């Protein structure tokens, strides 16, 4: 059936969110801000209530990189 109707859908999105945050932060740690933010915004995009995540991101990202995140939000 449609996405969300299978118990396995919840497990796949939880894994995806964690993967994207892990990949994003590795990329940012290597200096690839561009690709890092792509993955960070994928993570935010599947998060049902991303208030605290966004707030922590803006506290941990260089302001110019946070502005780029906003363009890809």
């Amino acid at each position: 059936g449609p996405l969300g109707s299978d118990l396995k859908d919840a497990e796949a999105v939880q894994k995806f969110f964690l993967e994207e945050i892990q990949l994003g932060e590795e990329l940012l740690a290597q200096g690839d801000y561009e690709k890092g933010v792509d993955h960070l915004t994928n993570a935010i995009a599947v998060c049902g209530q991303p208030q605290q995540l966004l707030q922590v991101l803006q506290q941990t990202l260089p302001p110019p990189v946070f502005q780029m995140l906003l363009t890809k939000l």
Binding site: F17, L18, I21, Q22, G24, E25, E26, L28, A29, L40, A43, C47, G48, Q49, P50, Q52, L53, Q55, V56, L57, T60
Partner: peptide, 13 residues
Amino acid sequence: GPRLSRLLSAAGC
């Protein structure tokens, strides 16, 4: 480093 991810996970959704 990359375990900064644990802060993002804690914030969660």
